């Protein structure tokens, strides 16, 4: 349809909390080949985050039930089967997001801000695959997540101020990747503390239109620090 017709209907789907509709509209906007505005970029991000987030939460619930029914043969087999069904849904969602990133989003990203955004998204959705993967296929998945995070991290530190919310949010998810996926509580703590300290050291670079976004991510960086320091 018309791109603006697809965008505002995705904004309606967001208010109605129909994120399957919201992701479908923003996917067609991406499939039209044109670069996304920062508004369309966030609508696509919010939509698929809710779509994949529902499966991650359901996966955690069914996975935990699977381990607490260890000595319940019939109940554990059903929990194992249901976890495998949610996993297949979760892998299809990420594979679509990663497909959109490699064909339209990252290749057509003209700006450093958008490239950092899409490379962080590539690392995020490979991290979501790593949460449900195992073996050598997981090792290749994990390395893809680290490569996307690292390239986005190097571009963000060369092109963005330490108080930039996209750079701060990238350091937040990168540190989460180190703690939860690579089980390095301090390659994450150092990264998170460095991002927090460098943002406080240059608080003069923070903009009025983005300072409540950046201050919030600085609070989250410090929460992960406090929690990982425990």
């Amino acid at each position: 349809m018309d791109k603006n017709e697809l965008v505002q209907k995705a904004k309606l789907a967001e208010q109605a909390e129909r994120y399957d509709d919201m992701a479908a509209c923003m996917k067609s906007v991406t499939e039209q080949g044109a670069e996304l505005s920062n508004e369309e970029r966030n609508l696509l991000s919010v939509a698929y985050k809710n779509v994949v987030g529902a499966r991650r939460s359901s996966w955690r619930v069914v996975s935990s039930i699977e381990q607490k029914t260890e000595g319940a043969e019939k109940k554990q087999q059903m929990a194992r089967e249901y976890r495998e069904k949610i996993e297949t849904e979760l892998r299809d969602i990420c594979n679509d997001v990663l497909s959109l990133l490699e064909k339209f989003l990252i290749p057509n990203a003209s700006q450093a801000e958008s490239k950092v955004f899409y490379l962080k998204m590539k690392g995020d959705y490979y991290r979501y695959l790593a949460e449900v993967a195992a073996g050598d296929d997981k090792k290749g998945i994990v390395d893809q997540s680290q490569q996307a995070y690292q390239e986005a991290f190097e571009i963000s530190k060369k092109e963005m101020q330490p108080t930039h919310p996209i750079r701060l949010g990238l350091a937040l998810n990168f540190s989460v990747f180190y703690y939860e996926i690579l089980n390095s509580p301090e390659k994450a703590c150092s990264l998170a503390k460095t991002a927090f300290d460098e943002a406080i050291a240059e608080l003069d670079t923070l903009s009025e239109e983005s300072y409540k976004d950046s201050t919030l991510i600085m609070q989250l960086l410090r929460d992960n620090l406090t929690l990982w320091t425990s």
């Binding site: 919010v46 995020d124 949010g169 937040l172 998810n173 991510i217 989250l220 929460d223 992960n224």
Partner: peptide
Amino acid sequence: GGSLPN
């Protein structure tokens, strides 16, 4: 408390 929210 974790990763980046919306």
